[PDB]
Amino acid sequence: SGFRKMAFPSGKVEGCMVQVTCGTTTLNGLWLDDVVYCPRHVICTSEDMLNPNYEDLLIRKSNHNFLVQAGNVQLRVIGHSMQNCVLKLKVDTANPKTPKYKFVRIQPGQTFSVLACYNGSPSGVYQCAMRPNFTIKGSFLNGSCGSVGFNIDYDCVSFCYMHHMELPTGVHAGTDLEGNFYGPFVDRQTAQAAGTDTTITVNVLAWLYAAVINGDRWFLNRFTTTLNDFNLVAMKYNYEPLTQDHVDILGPLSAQTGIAVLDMCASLKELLQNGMNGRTILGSALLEDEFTPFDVVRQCSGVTFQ
Amino acid sequence: SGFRKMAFPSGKVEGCMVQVTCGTTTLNGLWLDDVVYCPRHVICTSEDMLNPNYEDLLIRKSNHNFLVQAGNVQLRVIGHSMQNCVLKLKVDTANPKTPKYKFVRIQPGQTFSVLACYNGSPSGVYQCAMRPNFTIKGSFLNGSCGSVGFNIDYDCVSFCYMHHMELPTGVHAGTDLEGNFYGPFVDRQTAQAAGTDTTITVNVLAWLYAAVINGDRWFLNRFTTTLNDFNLVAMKYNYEPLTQDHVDILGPLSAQTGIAVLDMCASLKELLQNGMNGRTILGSALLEDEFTPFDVVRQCSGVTFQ
Ligand SMILES: *[C@H](O)[C@H](C[C@@H]1CCNC1=O)NC(=O)[C@H](CC1CC1)NC(=O)OCc1cccc(F)c1
Ligand SMILES: *[C@H](O)[C@H](C[C@@H]1CCNC1=O)NC(=O)[C@H](CC1CC1)NC(=O)OCc1cccc(F)c1
């Protein structure tokens, strides 16, 4: 037993990380088949960044201005194009380590692993959630752009995120691998508001179920509630409203634990209105919302990939 | 910026995971050069487990009783031997993916990544600490034994842990790769006490420094203290005593932040005596002790491996 914020194994994505340099700027690209994907702001200088005209900037540039290095062998660039906020550099050589892959735009509240990279090499891997406000709470320094977020379904890597920037509040923003930002952001160095964020109610419930599964039962109480009654208290506390779709997604966890979803809503309610009295749940003093129902079931039944 | 419990990239260890089966029991082995390492309790039946005579049990067994599968190709076993609580199965074939590696016995308070595996395939990766009481707080189900914990120094994988069992309190216990347990444990199904655990003071300090580095300063106060005065309050709160060796290890963080170590001890003190008033630090409502000074510096300056 036990419950941990576990990342996906990262080997298949490691084989895809390359270094991309344009002028003075270096960041990471993703090399799949004969294509390297990277944030288009690799073409900007530190002045250009304040308000780049990307089409004019890319115009200046030629294939030979893009230095793409895979380990200590780089690739010949034969083609370049701009798709939304990513560059696609067409290279000489198909990546012999390309995995089975998909490009996915994830929904708010879903989770993914991030392989933080610098200069084309892995620094580490961590798990995170797409916040309801299309930000993530990551660990990114200069050089980390082009690092990617992904899920794995057995042998298939679903790329869902590429890192582009940090917001004034220290959260992080990026695109999907078609270069469309999650959320209302643009790739320029201006002040940008993410919305009010909200807690992923269905994930908080899934985590309380993981707790019960792992023997942590103290917060279970004697009340029940109704959806409408529960959401009245959710909105006071910026929890995203709970729906029958969410109830159904919790169905398997509800039946495994023998605890009605609305009975667990009642327990969450008293936690939201009364705090934790200095208690912990699965080792946390906070209500944790970065685990989906599918993440809980995965962990608790030992799902593998290889 | 931002700060996350980040695991090491796990690709080099993935290439070393194999499935080892003896009788009805299946768990993971580590295949390096022409040797597979795995927990010796792979030879036990569920009766044998209550008090195994391992030498008598291993005696019965022959090389052909050990089924070792690497993906869908297994290996011919030509040799078997028992070293402390691990079996070494000598195989036909040197692992073509063996990385540069070392076997290390880690000190309490150090951290490592765990690649949780089932049936020889990766489920996920997470970071953890060797508790002062030589347990870890992991996520392990049946089948997970033989999963390994490791650090990476550029290209070198330092194996430090192999998982063997779960304790009555839900924590986890295991050996180094020479098969000697961390802590006072034996590999039999009896009730076993880990000691009183204690918080890794030097790591809590390193994490408060990571907080300051990342702009979280609210807990910084106006007091200082002395080592002896600080430890009086540590022991009340089961914190492991702070020494000048620890002060020196925090030296770099102290000088980067311009905050005396004893001034940060003073801040930790008031946190221990006054709680967090419902505040958070780097997103946690608890004092976090699973980051070493070296983990903090690594993260905040972007150290890579590949
Ligand atoms: C690329 O590697 C880098 C990743 C950043 C660096 C610090 N933490 C990160 O996540 N991205 C940028 O440097 C980005 C340039 C891209 C958008 C065109 N600029 C950025 O992140 O600036 C931060 C910021 C914060 C508040 C206000 C502001 F104007 C700019
Ligand atoms: C091997 O895969 C397994 C890993 C365990 C399974 C559940 N969570 C884990 O971490 N190890 C064992 O199953 C181990 C057999 C080894 C020691 C000879 N037995 C075990 O972990 O039993 C747990 C336990 C807890 C309290 C009291 C008790 F007697 C036994």
JSON list of C-alpha atoms in Angstrom, two decimals, chain B residues 111-272:
[
{"chain": "B", "resi": 111, "resn": "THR", "atom": "CA", "xyz": [17.06, 10.79, -1.08]},
{"chain": "B", "resi": 112, "resn": "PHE", "atom": "CA", "xyz": [16.65, 8.57, -4.11]},
{"chain": "B", "resi": 113, "resn": "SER", "atom": "CA", "xyz": [14.21, 7.80, -6.88]},
{"chain": "B", "resi": 114, "resn": "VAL", "atom": "CA", "xyz": [12.12, 4.63, -6.93]},
{"chain": "B", "resi": 115, "resn": "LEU", "atom": "CA", "xyz": [10.98, 3.00, -10.21]},
{"chain": "B", "resi": 116, "resn": "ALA", "atom": "CA", "xyz": [7.98, 1.00, -9.06]},
{"chain": "B", "resi": 117, "resn": "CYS", "atom": "CA", "xyz": [7.66, -2.11, -11.22]},
{"chain": "B", "resi": 118, "resn": "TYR", "atom": "CA", "xyz": [5.32, -5.12, -11.58]},
{"chain": "B", "resi": 119, "resn": "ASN", "atom": "CA", "xyz": [6.11, -8.23, -13.63]},
{"chain": "B", "resi": 120, "resn": "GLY", "atom": "CA", "xyz": [9.34, -6.65, -14.81]},
{"chain": "B", "resi": 121, "resn": "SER", "atom": "CA", "xyz": [7.69, -3.52, -16.31]},
{"chain": "B", "resi": 122, "resn": "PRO", "atom": "CA", "xyz": [7.69, 0.10, -15.02]},
{"chain": "B", "resi": 123, "resn": "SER", "atom": "CA", "xyz": [4.59, 1.54, -13.37]},
{"chain": "B", "resi": 124, "resn": "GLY", "atom": "CA", "xyz": [5.99, 4.91, -12.33]},
{"chain": "B", "resi": 125, "resn": "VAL", "atom": "CA", "xyz": [8.75, 6.87, -10.68]},
{"chain": "B", "resi": 126, "resn": "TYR", "atom": "CA", "xyz": [8.78, 8.87, -7.48]},
{"chain": "B", "resi": 127, "resn": "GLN", "atom": "CA", "xyz": [11.35, 10.51, -5.17]},
{"chain": "B", "resi": 128, "resn": "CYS", "atom": "CA", "xyz": [11.74, 9.62, -1.51]},
{"chain": "B", "resi": 129, "resn": "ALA", "atom": "CA", "xyz": [13.96, 9.81, 1.55]},
{"chain": "B", "resi": 130, "resn": "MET", "atom": "CA", "xyz": [15.64, 7.13, 3.67]},
{"chain": "B", "resi": 131, "resn": "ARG", "atom": "CA", "xyz": [13.95, 7.97, 6.96]},
{"chain": "B", "resi": 132, "resn": "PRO", "atom": "CA", "xyz": [16.21, 8.25, 10.02]},
{"chain": "B", "resi": 133, "resn": "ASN", "atom": "CA", "xyz": [14.59, 4.94, 11.05]},
{"chain": "B", "resi": 134, "resn": "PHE", "atom": "CA", "xyz": [15.68, 3.24, 7.78]},
{"chain": "B", "resi": 135, "resn": "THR", "atom": "CA", "xyz": [12.16, 2.97, 6.38]},
{"chain": "B", "resi": 136, "resn": "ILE", "atom": "CA", "xyz": [10.69, 4.66, 3.35]},
{"chain": "B", "resi": 137, "resn": "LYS", "atom": "CA", "xyz": [7.17, 5.95, 2.74]},
{"chain": "B", "resi": 138, "resn": "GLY", "atom": "CA", "xyz": [6.54, 4.44, -0.66]},
{"chain": "B", "resi": 139, "resn": "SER", "atom": "CA", "xyz": [3.78, 3.06, -2.91]},
{"chain": "B", "resi": 140, "resn": "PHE", "atom": "CA", "xyz": [4.25, -0.69, -3.21]},
{"chain": "B", "resi": 141, "resn": "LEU", "atom": "CA", "xyz": [1.71, -3.48, -3.84]},
{"chain": "B", "resi": 142, "resn": "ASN", "atom": "CA", "xyz": [2.19, -7.20, -4.25]},
{"chain": "B", "resi": 143, "resn": "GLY", "atom": "CA", "xyz": [4.53, -7.87, -7.14]},
{"chain": "B", "resi": 144, "resn": "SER", "atom": "CA", "xyz": [6.60, -4.72, -6.52]},
{"chain": "B", "resi": 145, "resn": "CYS", "atom": "CA", "xyz": [9.50, -6.38, -4.70]},
{"chain": "B", "resi": 146, "resn": "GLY", "atom": "CA", "xyz": [12.76, -6.10, -6.55]},
{"chain": "B", "resi": 147, "resn": "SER", "atom": "CA", "xyz": [11.89, -2.55, -7.65]},
{"chain": "B", "resi": 148, "resn": "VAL", "atom": "CA", "xyz": [15.00, -0.41, -7.06]},
{"chain": "B", "resi": 149, "resn": "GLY", "atom": "CA", "xyz": [15.90, 3.04, -5.77]},
{"chain": "B", "resi": 150, "resn": "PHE", "atom": "CA", "xyz": [18.68, 5.00, -7.35]},
{"chain": "B", "resi": 151, "resn": "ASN", "atom": "CA", "xyz": [20.46, 8.29, -7.90]},
{"chain": "B", "resi": 152, "resn": "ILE", "atom": "CA", "xyz": [22.14, 9.47, -11.10]},
{"chain": "B", "resi": 153, "resn": "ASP", "atom": "CA", "xyz": [25.47, 11.36, -11.27]},
{"chain": "B", "resi": 154, "resn": "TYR", "atom": "CA", "xyz": [25.67, 12.51, -14.90]},
{"chain": "B", "resi": 155, "resn": "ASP", "atom": "CA", "xyz": [25.99, 9.11, -16.63]},
{"chain": "B", "resi": 156, "resn": "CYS", "atom": "CA", "xyz": [26.36, 6.88, -13.55]},
{"chain": "B", "resi": 157, "resn": "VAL", "atom": "CA", "xyz": [23.43, 5.10, -11.89]},
{"chain": "B", "resi": 158, "resn": "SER", "atom": "CA", "xyz": [24.06, 4.52, -8.19]},
{"chain": "B", "resi": 159, "resn": "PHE", "atom": "CA", "xyz": [21.73, 1.76, -7.03]},
{"chain": "B", "resi": 160, "resn": "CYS", "atom": "CA", "xyz": [20.97, 2.12, -3.36]},
{"chain": "B", "resi": 161, "resn": "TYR", "atom": "CA", "xyz": [17.75, 0.25, -2.61]},
{"chain": "B", "resi": 162, "resn": "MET", "atom": "CA", "xyz": [15.75, -2.90, -3.40]},
{"chain": "B", "resi": 163, "resn": "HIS", "atom": "CA", "xyz": [12.23, -3.24, -2.10]},
{"chain": "B", "resi": 164, "resn": "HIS", "atom": "CA", "xyz": [11.33, -6.26, 0.03]},
{"chain": "B", "resi": 165, "resn": "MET", "atom": "CA", "xyz": [8.43, -5.68, 2.40]},
{"chain": "B", "resi": 166, "resn": "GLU", "atom": "CA", "xyz": [5.78, -3.56, 4.02]},
{"chain": "B", "resi": 167, "resn": "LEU", "atom": "CA", "xyz": [5.63, -2.90, 7.73]},
{"chain": "B", "resi": 168, "resn": "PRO", "atom": "CA", "xyz": [2.53, -2.90, 9.95]},
{"chain": "B", "resi": 169, "resn": "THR", "atom": "CA", "xyz": [2.45, 0.90, 9.85]},
{"chain": "B", "resi": 170, "resn": "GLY", "atom": "CA", "xyz": [2.34, 0.99, 6.01]},
{"chain": "B", "resi": 171, "resn": "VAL", "atom": "CA", "xyz": [5.93, 2.06, 5.59]},
{"chain": "B", "resi": 172, "resn": "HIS", "atom": "CA", "xyz": [8.41, 0.12, 3.50]},
{"chain": "B", "resi": 173, "resn": "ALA", "atom": "CA", "xyz": [11.67, -1.66, 4.10]},
{"chain": "B", "resi": 174, "resn": "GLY", "atom": "CA", "xyz": [14.33, -3.07, 1.87]},
{"chain": "B", "resi": 175, "resn": "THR", "atom": "CA", "xyz": [18.01, -3.78, 1.33]},
{"chain": "B", "resi": 176, "resn": "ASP", "atom": "CA", "xyz": [20.98, -2.33, -0.54]},
{"chain": "B", "resi": 177, "resn": "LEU", "atom": "CA", "xyz": [22.07, -4.20, -3.62]},
{"chain": "B", "resi": 178, "resn": "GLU", "atom": "CA", "xyz": [24.41, -6.39, -1.51]},
{"chain": "B", "resi": 179, "resn": "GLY", "atom": "CA", "xyz": [21.21, -7.63, 0.19]},
{"chain": "B", "resi": 180, "resn": "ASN", "atom": "CA", "xyz": [21.77, -6.10, 3.64]},
{"chain": "B", "resi": 181, "resn": "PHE", "atom": "CA", "xyz": [18.62, -4.51, 5.01]},
{"chain": "B", "resi": 182, "resn": "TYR", "atom": "CA", "xyz": [18.42, -0.89, 5.89]},
{"chain": "B", "resi": 183, "resn": "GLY", "atom": "CA", "xyz": [17.42, -0.91, 9.55]},
{"chain": "B", "resi": 184, "resn": "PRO", "atom": "CA", "xyz": [16.77, -3.81, 11.91]},
{"chain": "B", "resi": 185, "resn": "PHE", "atom": "CA", "xyz": [14.50, -5.74, 9.60]},
{"chain": "B", "resi": 186, "resn": "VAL", "atom": "CA", "xyz": [14.45, -9.42, 8.49]},
{"chain": "B", "resi": 187, "resn": "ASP", "atom": "CA", "xyz": [12.65, -10.85, 5.45]},
{"chain": "B", "resi": 188, "resn": "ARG", "atom": "CA", "xyz": [9.96, -12.83, 7.21]},
{"chain": "B", "resi": 189, "resn": "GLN", "atom": "CA", "xyz": [6.19, -12.19, 7.70]},
{"chain": "B", "resi": 190, "resn": "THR", "atom": "CA", "xyz": [6.26, -11.09, 11.32]},
{"chain": "B", "resi": 191, "resn": "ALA", "atom": "CA", "xyz": [5.33, -7.90, 13.09]},
{"chain": "B", "resi": 192, "resn": "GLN", "atom": "CA", "xyz": [8.37, -5.61, 13.06]},
{"chain": "B", "resi": 193, "resn": "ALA", "atom": "CA", "xyz": [8.82, -2.22, 14.68]},
{"chain": "B", "resi": 194, "resn": "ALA", "atom": "CA", "xyz": [10.70, 0.54, 13.00]},
{"chain": "B", "resi": 195, "resn": "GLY", "atom": "CA", "xyz": [11.99, 2.94, 15.56]},
{"chain": "B", "resi": 196, "resn": "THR", "atom": "CA", "xyz": [10.50, 6.25, 16.46]},
{"chain": "B", "resi": 197, "resn": "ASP", "atom": "CA", "xyz": [11.05, 8.29, 13.37]},
{"chain": "B", "resi": 198, "resn": "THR", "atom": "CA", "xyz": [12.52, 11.77, 13.45]},
{"chain": "B", "resi": 199, "resn": "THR", "atom": "CA", "xyz": [12.42, 14.67, 11.04]},
{"chain": "B", "resi": 200, "resn": "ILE", "atom": "CA", "xyz": [15.49, 15.41, 8.91]},
{"chain": "B", "resi": 201, "resn": "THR", "atom": "CA", "xyz": [16.25, 18.89, 10.28]},
{"chain": "B", "resi": 202, "resn": "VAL", "atom": "CA", "xyz": [18.95, 19.71, 7.71]},
{"chain": "B", "resi": 203, "resn": "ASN", "atom": "CA", "xyz": [16.52, 18.90, 4.89]},
{"chain": "B", "resi": 204, "resn": "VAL", "atom": "CA", "xyz": [13.75, 21.02, 6.44]},
{"chain": "B", "resi": 205, "resn": "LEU", "atom": "CA", "xyz": [16.20, 23.91, 6.50]},
{"chain": "B", "resi": 206, "resn": "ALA", "atom": "CA", "xyz": [17.21, 23.27, 2.88]},
{"chain": "B", "resi": 207, "resn": "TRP", "atom": "CA", "xyz": [13.53, 23.36, 1.88]},
{"chain": "B", "resi": 208, "resn": "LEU", "atom": "CA", "xyz": [12.94, 26.67, 3.74]},
{"chain": "B", "resi": 209, "resn": "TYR", "atom": "CA", "xyz": [15.93, 28.01, 1.78]},
{"chain": "B", "resi": 210, "resn": "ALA", "atom": "CA", "xyz": [14.38, 26.72, -1.48]},
{"chain": "B", "resi": 211, "resn": "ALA", "atom": "CA", "xyz": [11.27, 28.63, -0.34]},
{"chain": "B", "resi": 212, "resn": "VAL", "atom": "CA", "xyz": [13.13, 31.90, 0.16]},
{"chain": "B", "resi": 213, "resn": "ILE", "atom": "CA", "xyz": [14.89, 31.34, -3.19]},
{"chain": "B", "resi": 214, "resn": "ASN", "atom": "CA", "xyz": [11.43, 30.95, -4.79]},
{"chain": "B", "resi": 215, "resn": "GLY", "atom": "CA", "xyz": [10.01, 34.13, -3.22]},
{"chain": "B", "resi": 216, "resn": "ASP", "atom": "CA", "xyz": [8.14, 32.52, -0.28]},
{"chain": "B", "resi": 217, "resn": "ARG", "atom": "CA", "xyz": [9.44, 34.64, 2.64]},
{"chain": "B", "resi": 218, "resn": "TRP", "atom": "CA", "xyz": [6.54, 35.11, 5.07]},
{"chain": "B", "resi": 219, "resn": "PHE", "atom": "CA", "xyz": [7.97, 32.79, 7.77]},
{"chain": "B", "resi": 220, "resn": "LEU", "atom": "CA", "xyz": [11.25, 34.72, 7.92]},
{"chain": "B", "resi": 221, "resn": "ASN", "atom": "CA", "xyz": [11.41, 36.43, 11.24]},
{"chain": "B", "resi": 222, "resn": "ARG", "atom": "CA", "xyz": [13.33, 38.81, 13.42]},
{"chain": "B", "resi": 223, "resn": "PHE", "atom": "CA", "xyz": [14.96, 36.37, 15.87]},
{"chain": "B", "resi": 224, "resn": "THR", "atom": "CA", "xyz": [18.14, 34.41, 15.85]},
{"chain": "B", "resi": 225, "resn": "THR", "atom": "CA", "xyz": [19.23, 31.48, 18.00]},
{"chain": "B", "resi": 226, "resn": "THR", "atom": "CA", "xyz": [22.14, 29.17, 18.88]},
{"chain": "B", "resi": 227, "resn": "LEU", "atom": "CA", "xyz": [22.75, 25.55, 17.91]},
{"chain": "B", "resi": 228, "resn": "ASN", "atom": "CA", "xyz": [22.32, 24.31, 21.48]},
{"chain": "B", "resi": 229, "resn": "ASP", "atom": "CA", "xyz": [19.21, 26.46, 21.95]},
{"chain": "B", "resi": 230, "resn": "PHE", "atom": "CA", "xyz": [17.77, 25.26, 18.62]},
{"chain": "B", "resi": 231, "resn": "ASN", "atom": "CA", "xyz": [18.36, 21.56, 19.39]},
{"chain": "B", "resi": 232, "resn": "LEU", "atom": "CA", "xyz": [16.53, 21.86, 22.73]},
{"chain": "B", "resi": 233, "resn": "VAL", "atom": "CA", "xyz": [13.44, 22.61, 20.70]},
{"chain": "B", "resi": 234, "resn": "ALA", "atom": "CA", "xyz": [14.30, 20.06, 17.99]},
{"chain": "B", "resi": 235, "resn": "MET", "atom": "CA", "xyz": [14.32, 17.16, 20.43]},
{"chain": "B", "resi": 236, "resn": "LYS", "atom": "CA", "xyz": [10.96, 18.21, 21.89]},
{"chain": "B", "resi": 237, "resn": "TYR", "atom": "CA", "xyz": [9.66, 17.84, 18.30]},
{"chain": "B", "resi": 238, "resn": "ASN", "atom": "CA", "xyz": [11.66, 14.74, 17.22]},
{"chain": "B", "resi": 239, "resn": "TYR", "atom": "CA", "xyz": [13.93, 16.70, 14.91]},
{"chain": "B", "resi": 240, "resn": "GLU", "atom": "CA", "xyz": [17.31, 15.15, 14.46]},
{"chain": "B", "resi": 241, "resn": "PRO", "atom": "CA", "xyz": [19.96, 17.34, 16.14]},
{"chain": "B", "resi": 242, "resn": "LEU", "atom": "CA", "xyz": [21.70, 20.01, 14.05]},
{"chain": "B", "resi": 243, "resn": "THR", "atom": "CA", "xyz": [25.52, 20.02, 13.96]},
{"chain": "B", "resi": 244, "resn": "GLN", "atom": "CA", "xyz": [28.19, 22.25, 12.45]},
{"chain": "B", "resi": 245, "resn": "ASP", "atom": "CA", "xyz": [28.64, 19.62, 9.74]},
{"chain": "B", "resi": 246, "resn": "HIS", "atom": "CA", "xyz": [25.01, 20.38, 8.85]},
{"chain": "B", "resi": 247, "resn": "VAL", "atom": "CA", "xyz": [25.60, 24.15, 9.12]},
{"chain": "B", "resi": 248, "resn": "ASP", "atom": "CA", "xyz": [28.54, 23.78, 6.73]},
{"chain": "B", "resi": 249, "resn": "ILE", "atom": "CA", "xyz": [26.48, 21.72, 4.30]},
{"chain": "B", "resi": 250, "resn": "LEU", "atom": "CA", "xyz": [23.93, 24.57, 4.28]},
{"chain": "B", "resi": 251, "resn": "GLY", "atom": "CA", "xyz": [26.76, 27.04, 3.76]},
{"chain": "B", "resi": 252, "resn": "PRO", "atom": "CA", "xyz": [26.15, 27.55, 0.03]},
{"chain": "B", "resi": 253, "resn": "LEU", "atom": "CA", "xyz": [22.39, 28.06, 0.49]},
{"chain": "B", "resi": 254, "resn": "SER", "atom": "CA", "xyz": [23.00, 30.36, 3.46]},
{"chain": "B", "resi": 255, "resn": "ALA", "atom": "CA", "xyz": [25.33, 32.56, 1.39]},
{"chain": "B", "resi": 256, "resn": "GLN", "atom": "CA", "xyz": [23.21, 32.56, -1.77]},
{"chain": "B", "resi": 257, "resn": "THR", "atom": "CA", "xyz": [20.18, 33.75, 0.23]},
{"chain": "B", "resi": 258, "resn": "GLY", "atom": "CA", "xyz": [22.13, 36.01, 2.63]},
{"chain": "B", "resi": 259, "resn": "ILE", "atom": "CA", "xyz": [20.32, 34.39, 5.57]},
{"chain": "B", "resi": 260, "resn": "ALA", "atom": "CA", "xyz": [22.41, 33.03, 8.40]},
{"chain": "B", "resi": 261, "resn": "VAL", "atom": "CA", "xyz": [21.73, 29.36, 9.05]},
{"chain": "B", "resi": 262, "resn": "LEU", "atom": "CA", "xyz": [21.04, 30.18, 12.72]},
{"chain": "B", "resi": 263, "resn": "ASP", "atom": "CA", "xyz": [18.63, 32.90, 11.65]},
{"chain": "B", "resi": 264, "resn": "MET", "atom": "CA", "xyz": [16.74, 30.27, 9.66]},
{"chain": "B", "resi": 265, "resn": "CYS", "atom": "CA", "xyz": [16.90, 27.88, 12.60]},
{"chain": "B", "resi": 266, "resn": "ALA", "atom": "CA", "xyz": [15.20, 30.71, 14.53]},
{"chain": "B", "resi": 267, "resn": "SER", "atom": "CA", "xyz": [12.43, 30.87, 11.92]},
{"chain": "B", "resi": 268, "resn": "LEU", "atom": "CA", "xyz": [12.00, 27.08, 11.97]},
{"chain": "B", "resi": 269, "resn": "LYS", "atom": "CA", "xyz": [11.74, 27.22, 15.77]},
{"chain": "B", "resi": 270, "resn": "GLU", "atom": "CA", "xyz": [8.94, 29.64, 15.72]},
{"chain": "B", "resi": 271, "resn": "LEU", "atom": "CA", "xyz": [7.20, 27.45, 13.05]},
{"chain": "B", "resi": 272, "resn": "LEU", "atom": "CA", "xyz": [7.62, 24.39, 15.30]}
]
